[PDB]
């Protein structure tokens, strides 16, 4: 494949209310090291959970790219499903579907998780997770039009932003 | 701004 250029940056469960989807994250530009300072560690621990949500809206997205112009500010990474067998991946993949997927498409919004430094309650990392939309198709269009084509309408897949603020 | 998943 065409994933050997995107490599797998971080391998874990995520989490949106009570449901989970096993992932892997290829780094697609900006700055790797935001995804090593930001993410978890996923050997056991609880998921990266997504507790909060953006409208998918005018300003929340100019909010969004006004944090990508930089390539050392952000980092853009591809969610794609895994698991241990092609039983586990067919399950793991419709989890993501329908439980991440459709319901961020249903309610119009990315994901929204909030890193602390610990001793600090001011956010050092936003991570925004997008299902795949106009906002997403914008970016990889701009930023990896192989990978996009590769997976449009295809796989299914989020888009995570990662911002350091 | 954001808002709380259900």
């Given at each position: 494949?065409?994933?050997?250029?995107?490599?797998?940056?971080?391998?874990?469960?995520?989490?949106?209310?009570?449901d989970?989807?096993?992932?892997q994250?290829?780094?697609?530009?900006?700055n790797?090291?935001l995804?090593?300072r930001?993410?978890p560690?996923?050997?056991?621990?609880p998921?990266?959970?997504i507790?909060?949500?953006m409208?998918l809206?005018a300003?929340?997205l100019?909010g969004?790219?006004?944090?990508m112009?930089?390539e050392?500010?952000?980092?853009?990474?591809?969610?794609?499903?895994?698991?241990?067998?092609?039983?586990?991946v067919?399950?793991?993949?419709?989890?993501?579907?329908?439980?991440f997927?459709?319901?961020?498409?249903?309610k119009?919004?990315?994901?929204?998780?909030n890193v602390?430094?610990?001793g600090s309650?001011?956010?050092?990392?936003?991570?925004?997770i997008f299902?795949?939309?106009?906002?997403?198709?914008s970016?990889l269009?701009?930023?990896a039009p192989?990978?996009?084509?590769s997976?449009?309408?295809?796989?299914p897949?989020?888009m995570?932003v990662?911002?350091?603020? | 701004?954001?808002?709380?998943?259900?």
């Amino acid at each position: 494949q065409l994933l050997k250029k995107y490599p797998i940056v971080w391998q874990g469960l995520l989490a949106l209310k009570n449901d989970t989807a096993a992932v892997q994250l290829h780094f697609v530009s900006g700055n790797n090291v935001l995804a090593h300072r930001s993410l978890p560690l996923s050997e056991g621990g609880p998921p990266l959970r997504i507790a909060q949500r953006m409208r998918l809206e005018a300003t929340q997205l100019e909010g969004v790219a006004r944090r990508m112009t930089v390539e050392t500010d952000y980092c853009l990474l591809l969610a794609l499903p895994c698991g241990r067998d092609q039983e586990d991946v067919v399950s793991q993949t419709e989890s993501l579907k329908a439980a991440f997927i459709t319901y961020l498409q249903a309610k119009q919004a990315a994901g929204i998780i909030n890193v602390p430094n610990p001793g600090s309650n001011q956010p050092a990392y936003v991570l925004q997770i997008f299902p795949p939309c106009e906002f997403s198709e914008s970016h990889l269009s701009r930023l990896a039009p192989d990978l996009l084509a590769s997976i449009s309408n295809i796989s299914p897949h989020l888009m995570i932003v990662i911002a350091s603020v | 701004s954001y808002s709380p998943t259900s």
